[PDB]
Write a protein that binds this ligand. Structure first.
Ligand SMILES: NC(=O)c1ccc[n+]([C@@H]2O[C@H](COP(=O)([O-])OP(=O)(O)OC[C@H]3O[C@@H](n4cnc5c(N)ncnc54)[C@H](O)[C@@H]3O)[C@@H](O)[C@H]2O)c1
Ligand SMILES: NC(=O)c1ccc[n+]([C@@H]2O[C@H](COP(=O)([O-])OP(=O)(O)OC[C@H]3O[C@@H](n4cnc5c(N)ncnc54)[C@H](O)[C@@H]3O)[C@@H](O)[C@H]2O)c1
Ligand SMILES: CCCC(=O)C(=O)O
Ligand SMILES: CCCC(=O)C(=O)O
Lengths: 379, 412, 412, 379
């Protein structure tokens, strides 16, 4: 389902780049995927086994990088498909990294912390021979957190005997992690929103992980909204003390609208600059409508990826010995988010002027990968 | 669907054994499965990519063991199912080996010899971190041969720098291999089939034998069984088969394959389809080709007194019941085709020991394990489980050892 | 014969330093040399085998470092000699790197691109146990390029399973490389040549420059030196050269190579032989091709005030003396072409650090080391050793660090 | 010098087997060769550096196997050439092994035991990354002994941290070595001499390492000789108490003559069966003369190689855990010396009947190697 859309999106992009179907077959299918059986024992002695996956999609540009999600609906193909988005995303942001992802078919709610810990450990253990700081670097995803990374990390240290901080990302700050991890996506969305209005009055549909920091860094904001709504105060709201208190907003009248959380309500937004703060804030129709309407949409794969850049800098930090200051890490995100958007402005002019920035982004993502593979003699 | 079948057979025996469905769940699933993408550049510059799998089913009793098949219809699920049967085969014969198997989705016929080498090398290279003399020892299966094993071998020595002969089995005798291994599976099937006939249907001499498949298993099965005084009245391959109730010259039959492509083109006999062969009149039927070839629909029509399973997983679970209902004796593959794995256990053992087992010591090592495992099965059937088919008894033994070993290691 | 020359130059400086001939014997010899046999299958099935070397000269100051050249005349002895100069170059510039170099006896022109890849991969594969990010980091030399480094890279990731970018330097910028590295050697030679001209012959502007060689070093040397206001009045390659006292358009010159094969075919100028070029009238002569190109016989005829050595080992030891006798200043290669190794030190350093050095930080990192090493050499010449040529002073520094480090490690 | 004769002998044999010159180029040149600088410090503080080599000729059939010689005249090319003889010899005796050899340019006489020890250690150390029980297995040669192997062994244990007995051969019996090492060549020469007279009154020019044991096992001997001569007692001399006492013999009248230590004295030997106990007991002329004269000559490469077979069994023993009894090791030499000679009798009939047994032996040696390489896709 996610797979089939990702393969489709890919073949669409391959024809546009002028690629053999055989060359796109390569790009499509993952290099390696492993599946592992995890037996977990409950307090009562009850035995349950759980199946999990690591899809290592592509490593043209570097070692596989990407998080691990726990969930009762995860499937081999969801993991693979998520592999692929990571390949393209890392490519676009010019990271020394390829695409990987992992998942386990489990409902974490139905497990104690002791069982999760045991589950997290055994997954790592069953796949470690294709993990490493220089081969495959997992991270948090859905139902996975810095705590999951500490269990991953400790179990790795148990097997290899090395305190290799950089093998996992999203780690707690006291175990090789870095501070910006929380304001990464935000700093990301913010620095993209700013230099995008420069080339081409803010609203933010959200104030959680991303929205709040997107709001703070940009003001350094006429709208705000929660799962319970917000206020279109034209003053510009106080971004701090909105935290002390914890359809209209989209259609509202602004210069930048930042979804941080359809064809119907698409031709009504008055924002002439979209900075997609989460994944999939628009539909396949609502780009048609935004493109026709001449309103610039900066997509998921770039605007929301201050997080994976944050994990890169965490990775970089570990290898440098943890010397990178928070000041210097901040600047590395902005450098890596500016550089990547200016290559997507410069590719956008010299060719594919006709085309949407999502399609052009992932084009450039594939172009960079195929280019690396050609140079290594892999096609 | 091999998976589905093999899982049903495991539950059948699990419930008999008194195992929780949670335990059987653990046994059922492979510990680790890898799929890998293999890209091949034709001589004209056409790029073809192919998918392969290595299924590492169970490692309670030792490192994973088993063959790799190349074929257009191989699938993740069947290689996992072939994994399963390795586990039981290795357990039944008391080998320090778990169960594993590999497969690639490819039609070797549509590739050149240079393409298959490249293919073979990249397969190994893409999984080699979960291979080893003490991790996972592959071997030949369908459309794989000692040459395949030499490309595998050679590629592993390049990657690691070590001439560890024991990482692959079924190797040419000049590269750490052992001559018996070429024909150990067929010799095993022949040996078991004769013991079975002596104990059940009045012996092997004069006996009318149909063999489906005429490759490394089927040919050698037929050769040895013919040397032993059996009458081989039917033979077949992918191309179809031939029944001659006056017997078939096996060597000449092979020549007809070599000069023709298939064994339907045997001149002295009646051409039959594979389905027709399976239900043709015979004393002993030996499926020595592919799985699930006898099912709920043709099993009522099978005419043999005794089925000896050369191939991995020839009958469905429903076929197993019917054979039981009809009083038709089936020698499990877990025991009948073990001459392969036993032969490669000795190949392996000889490698670690440094090459100091002669070809006759080896031959004896293989035949003896084979018979002893038969006599164990036979005796254990008479004493306990005398109302169950043989595969059930074999499986009981095989599954019990594995669970025992998992218990001790604290895995269960 | 590069070996012979480089050994003489080392004894010259050793005796000056007051080292026992036993010590110089140790310094002289490479710690380890590998030769390997590489077999290549042409598209028609013709088998060609080629010999390559990796010379690991000295590792006192760190892991071995240096390029690989492909060429029909490369020899064990020259790669060992090129090793030596790496040691001194790495020591003079305070890099945590010993000296190494590689070579293959092959004419790349007579191979296809598919043959050179195979060639490049098997070279690495046959020595890879004595390579590593912390053992021996190769890089481009003559007839080797970022593409070569990518085949090397890719083959190493296959063998080991690890994407350690830092195992090779001069890599394409999209595979762990750094853009400055493409032109760091030429930028270094240009930078040093300008500083040298400002301090000795009244500056670089208007200055008449002959460059022998027009590849990765010579072209970029000429480009930057031309950007800096020098007049490049002669250029050459294997095909011969051209002198135009009105200056040569460097970019257009490169185009004449690209569309023609050689730079003799430059339209606006006088065609000369390489020998004629070397002794042609100029302010600054920059050998940026091969070794031993100036010797006892043409050194008396060299017309330049200042020789800047782009290439490794351009003058013989006898040429060095003559240049001294005649008062002709020679900037050692150990310092002039270091922009390469400095550029790849930063490429390497950036890899281990995770890719977080920008291309401008890198550029500055390289230029600064280059100048500082010049100023050190210059100042150290004025204070001690003011009666010795510059190469002697540089060598004094370089050799002394190495012996110091060997002492502390108890190797000497 | 040794090189050029070995390359020549090889190209002679390649044409006879019907091989491309490009295929013989491969076979000729070694796969890898390394050279290492060894600095040794004397008691007086004097520093001396010594250059040494490991030539790893071919590994078609298995890991490189072959000894290390010390000597002031050893050269890279002597080592390479010695590589090659080992490749062919191992092939002929059907060993799971290829050809390697090593040497150091040193006069051991001019070094103390402390300096030799240090020299022996550092050689191993400088090459260990291409040594191992499964990659390259050195042994004793000239000016090298079981004591040299103990220093090799200990230094290896120091680097790797593993007591891998099988990495070196010729070890003292109390450090992974085996008993037959002394009567190996003898048992070799003896069992070859016996089953050769069967197919087709003994003399032995020598009674040292090989001669004595060749004499004992065969009697279980009308001639004997030393560097100081012997006695042609027609009784058959007492082989034991000849040890208690420590041109004519060759020309003498016997059925088997066994040189254990030229055209001129070649047409006079009355022996109709030569079992070459040392290397090069005949000349390139004296085979012409022996062949013409119809007198069967069993060459160096097979008859004297009970030693390398002995080291194989030592190797085999180490890997099996040192369980092989002296009884069982004895039988393994004879099995490996019979098998190898019966393949050289069976190849000799089916083809190359016209040809000498030296040329036919090394033919079969090359045929087996090229065959293995073909199967591995190496030519
Ligand atoms: N001895 C071994 O190396 C070995 C090892 C492992 C497993 N096995 C098992 O034994 C069986 C035989 O394999 P093999 O090694 O002889 O293979 P093979 O490739 O040597 O020969 C296969 C034979 O089966 C025939 N065949 C293929 N598809 C067929 C079909 N659909 N219907 C009928 N015949 C068909 C082929 O034409 C050929 O005659 C397989 O089930 C295999 O899993 C054998
Ligand atoms: N920047 C680098 O990558 C690098 C690295 C290490 C060493 N170097 C040294 O710098 C020098 C230049 O090498 P490069 O990288 O520019 O090589 P290159 O292969 O890029 O170019 C070689 C150039 O020299 C010319 N040449 C070749 N043989 C010649 C001859 N006999 N006479 C005159 N010209 C000849 C070629 O035609 C070409 O113009 C060499 O001595 C090399 O050892 C350069
Ligand atoms: C040696 C493995 C044989 C095999 O895979 C089989 O018998 O199925
Ligand atoms: C980075 C190595 C460069 C080199 O080999 C040289 O400058 O000679």
């Amino acid at each position: 389902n996610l797979l089939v859309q990702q393969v489709k999106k890919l073949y669409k992009v391959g024809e546009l780049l002028g690629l053999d179907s055989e060359t796109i077959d390569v790009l499509s299918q993952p290099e390696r995927v492993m599946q592992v059986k995890i037996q977990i024992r409950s307090s009562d002695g009850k035995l349950r086994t759980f199946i999990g996956w690591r899809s290592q999609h592509n490593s043209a540009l570097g070692p596989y990088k990407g998080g691990v999600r726990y969930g009762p609906n995860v499937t081999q193909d969801e993991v693979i498909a998520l592999s692929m988005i990571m390949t393209w995303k890392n490519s676009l942001l010019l990271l020394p990294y390829g695409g990987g992802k992992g998942g386990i078919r489990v409902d974490p709610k139905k497990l104690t912390l002791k069982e999760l810990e045991d589950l997290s450990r055994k997954y790592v253990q069953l796949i470690h021979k294709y993990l490493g700081s220089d081969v495959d670097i997992p991270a948090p995803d859905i139902n996975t957190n810095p705590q999951t990374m500490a269990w991953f990390l400790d179990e790795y240290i148990k097997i290899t005997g090395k305190v290799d901080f950089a093998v996992f990302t999203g780690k707690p700050s006291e175990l090789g992690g870095i501070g910006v991890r929380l304001y990464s996506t935000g700093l990301g969305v913010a620095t993209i929103a700013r230099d995008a209005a420069n080339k081409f009055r803010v609203i933010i549909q959200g104030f959680g992980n991303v929205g709040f920091f997107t709001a703070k860094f940009l003001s350094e904001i006429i709208g705000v909204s929660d799962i319970g709504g917000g206020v279109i105060n034209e003053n510009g709201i106080d971004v701090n003390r909105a935290l002390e208190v914890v359809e209209e907003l989209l259609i509202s009248d602004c210069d930048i609208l930042i979804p941080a959380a359809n064809k119907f309500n698409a031709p009504k937004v008055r924002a002439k600059l979209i900075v997609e703060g989460a994944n999939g804030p628009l539909t396949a129709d609502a780009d048609e409508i935004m493109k026709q309407r001449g309103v610039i949409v900066i997509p998921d794969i770039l605007a929301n990826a201050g997080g994976v850049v944050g994990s890169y800098v965490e990775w970089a930090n570990n290898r440098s010995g943890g010397i990178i200051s928070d000041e210097e890490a901040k600047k590395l995100i902005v450098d890596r988010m500016i550089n990547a958007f200016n290559t997507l402005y410069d590719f956008h002019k010299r060719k594919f002027a006709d085309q949407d920035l999502r399609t052009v982004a992932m084009a450039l993502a594939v172009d960079r990968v195929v280019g690396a593979m050609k140079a290594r003699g892999l096609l």
